[PDB]
Design a protein around this nucleic acid. Structure first.
Lengths: 351, 351
DNA sequence: ATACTAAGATAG
DNA sequence: CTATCTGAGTAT
């Protein structure tokens, strides 16, 4: 039972990029399940074998982490092409991990055949004919089907909480009480549209000491529709395995709403936050039914509520520790189900 | 008082390179102050002592010419590493000359520890703990504090017109009346974005016989946001300390704006142009408050103001001299106050 | 060959 | 939008 996992459109080397670190963490958690698995990527590395140095048919299961197939600057992206070349040569069923609604499986050939560099590839080289099963992170399989109604070789759809790999990792550790230095903290990147509105709403002009870490830059918030005076402090990105300790430096860590996740996907951030020493405050829009934590106090709808809830927390150490113990209790109930989780995954890749 | 001066990331031997010349010229101007100074670098030379043969703690003052940490080809950069090991062993305050907004002081250790060759160094030998005093060439100390935010041991800030070392040199001599063969001249290299914009706004489609020397070619200008028909004449590189001799060839030398220096840093260029037989014209953005010269005639806004002024100088050999006589009187008044500059420097390195 | 380059591409 | 990531090309 030899399993191969690859990222469809991103180089896999270290933990310095989101797609790469996720592919490696998926490889690590699948290994810890007692499965023999390799990561194939563009070159040999600490975690990967080269596409050029293996026959895709030496594996009984091919898992493909979703990625986009857009070619930046119209130039050839070897990460995409080499991965699909590899997929096309596979004579068996392909398991596509759908963790981002914006990244449904997609053939590259069509987007390649009309390129100046088209001569480099042939349709037989890139066209994937194998049947594909989509393992959707989003519980709503209707949305998963919709996004793939463009590709006919997708024949199975199944829901599997992939993002739970962060809490099921053997070395998982709850954050320990921490000396606070921030009222509210939020990690992410800038995104125009409703995403800008949402962020200015919860992070700007709160009157609280807030830190926005990640890839966002203050000067990206210019839209006159969502004005502001006092912005939060911006910080550089942080290692995947440091997120929870980074969040723990604040009394409260926020989860903002997003049209591509709301009531459908539980995200890595939810767990990273719920695991920290920071009380997890969730944008009502993100989880209307409160599937995450069955306690209204963990939810906020606007700036007034966020400000009010955070101030109740910065004064009441007792209220803070209680909420903290409730979110840790909920996390652990989920963790207790590890074995069911692992079997569900084996079951999802027909093992 | 024994003073040691080093360049953080460049080797110092002679005047064959930009950074080396700067360090040696800084060295000479300080020696001419009657101070005891030594240049410490990689190998012993006419102007330098080797890092591996001197004990940094023998000096009462350690001056570090700003530089960047860029490990070309991912390989160890000996000037940066030797320099920072030297600085790390130092036990008193460090004086960092910030002559370029792009070169804030930076620790190299965080960079080295994650390199495959990290085992060749220890944090004890690279981590610089001594307090740092940034002596900024820019007069806006807020722009200087802003740049050194990442660092924590940078305690002081102070402005000092460092670029003036060229005029106060016991060597300095104004350029004598030169036979004109160019209407306009400008030295430098192109970068991108607005850098190219400006260079095209002031040196292209003017109808004037303009020359452009340094690291720059014609095709390097593609951006269809700033279109041009007739480009100036590119003369490539010239010696490394004959800029004044070069500029004097034209009727007027140009100083164009730059997001980094504008209303902050007076550059070596300014003084090398102000010292030439060429009338120095300045981009209004580079110095709006008109600090350089107090006379509107030397400043321009766009291609219009430019070509116009150059014409007034061509059709009035009398006007040329008058303005030329003005800039020289300014330089002369600055040079006469050499002692005020020197004493200001001493007070900068706490003497 | 020798020595210098004040760093360009990428992340989200 | 720049902090972070990657890792030899250019000038003598």
């Amino acid at each position: 039972m030899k399993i191969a996992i690859i990222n469809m459109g991103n180089n896999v080397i270290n933990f310095k990029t989101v797609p790469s670190s996720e592919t490696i963490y998926l490889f690590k958690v699948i290994s810890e399940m007692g499965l023999n698995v390799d990561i194939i990527s563009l070159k040999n590395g600490v975690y990967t074998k080269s596409f050029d140095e293996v026959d895709v048919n030496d594996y009984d299961r091919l898992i493909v982490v979703n990625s986009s197939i857009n070619f930046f600057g119209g130039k050839p992206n070897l990460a995409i092409l080499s991965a699909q070349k590899f997929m096309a040569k596979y004579k068996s069923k392909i398991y596509y991990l759908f963790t981002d609604i914006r990244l449904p499986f997609s053939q590259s050939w069509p987007n390649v055949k009309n390129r100046p560099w088209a001569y480099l590839y042939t349709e037989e080289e890139l066209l994937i004919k194998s049947p594909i099963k989509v393992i959707s992170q989003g519980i709503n399989l209707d949305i998963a089907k919709a996004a793939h109604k463009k590709v006919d070789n997708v024949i199975e759809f199944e829901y599997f909480p992939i993002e739970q790999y962060k809490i099921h990792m053997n070395d998982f550790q709850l954050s320990k009480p921490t000396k606070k230095t921030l009222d509210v903290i939020y990690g992410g990147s800038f995104r125009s549209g409703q995403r800008e509105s949402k962020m200015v709403e919860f992070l700007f002009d709160t009157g609280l000491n807030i830190e926005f870490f990640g890839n966002a830059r203050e000067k990206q918030f210019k839209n006159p529709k969502y004005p502001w005076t006092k912005a939060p402090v911006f910080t550089g990105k942080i290692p995947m395995n440091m997120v929870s300790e980074k969040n723990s430096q604040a009394i409260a860590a926020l989860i903002i709403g997003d049209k591509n996740y709301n009531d459908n996907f539980i995200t890595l951030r939810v767990w990273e936050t719920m695991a920290s020493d920071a009380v997890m405050l969730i944008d009502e829009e993100f989880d209307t039914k409160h599937r995450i934590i069955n306690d209204a106090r963990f939810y906020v709808n606007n700036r007034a509520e966020l400000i009010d809830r955070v101030n109740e927390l910065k004064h009441s150490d007792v209220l803070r520790k209680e909420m903290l113990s409730i979110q840790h209790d909920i996390l652990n109930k989920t963790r207790a189900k590890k074995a069911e989780w692992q079997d569900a995954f084996k079951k999802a890749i027909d093992l």
